[PDB]
């Protein structure tokens, strides 16, 4: 079926901005982890365990959350292993939203001003 992932990426904003994430039409009961998961290695991405707020799907099958995009964050995988400190000063960051396994909406990139 066609889900309804409506998120608000930080385009043209500075660091410390609150990214709005609202995913509807998901699996009610599943916990979705969302963070500023950006590129950390070749084909490898990593989320931030510092300012993260995993949201569980409600009885409507929707999950709304908000994350704070930092300039530098600790990159962590979905398994629990870290990859290193990611820094988006000269590079651009992005938002990552997926379940404990790694399924969900497509990633959206963000850019500072």
Ligand X SMILES: O=c1cc(-c2ccccc2)oc2ccccc12
Q: Which residues contact 25 (CB under 8 A, 6 or more apart)?
A: 1, 2, 3, 4, 5, 61, 62
Q: Rule CB under 6 A: say whether 25 interacts with ligand X.
A: no
DSSP string, 29-79: T-EEEEE--EEEETTEEEB-SSS---EE--TTSEEEEEEE--SEEEEE-SS
Q: Rule CB under 6 A: say whether 96 interacts with ligand X.
A: yes
Q: Rule CB under 6 A: say whether 78 interacts with ligand X.
A: yes
Q: Give the nearer residue to ligand X in terms of CB position, either 17 or 76.
A: 76
Question: Which range touches ligand X (CB under 6 A), out of 11-19, 23-31, 71-79, 85-93?
Answer: 71-79
Q: Rule CB under 6 A: say whether 44 interacts with ligand X.
A: yes
Q: Give the nearer residue to ligand X in terms of CB position, either 17 or 21.
A: 21
Q: Give the nearer residue to ligand X in terms of CB position, either 17 or 37.
A: 37
Cα 100 from chain centre: 13
**Binding stretches for ligand X (CB under 6 A):** 37, 44-47, 76-78, 96-98, 107
């Amino acid at each position: 079926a066609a889900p309804t992932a409506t998120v608000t990426p930080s385009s043209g904003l500075s660091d410390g901005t609150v990214v709005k994430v609202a995913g509807a039409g998901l699996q009610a009961g599943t916990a979705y982890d969302v963070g500023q998961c950006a590129w950390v290695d070749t084909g490898v991405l990593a989320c931030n365990p510092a300012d993260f707020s995993s949201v569980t799907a409600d009885a409507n099958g929707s999950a709304s959350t908000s994350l704070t995009v930092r300039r530098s964050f600790e990159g962590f995988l979905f398994d629990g292993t870290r990859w290193g400190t990611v820094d988006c000063t000269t590079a651009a960051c992005q938002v990552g939203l997926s379940d404990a396994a790694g399924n969900g909406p497509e990633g959206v990139a963000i850019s500072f001003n």
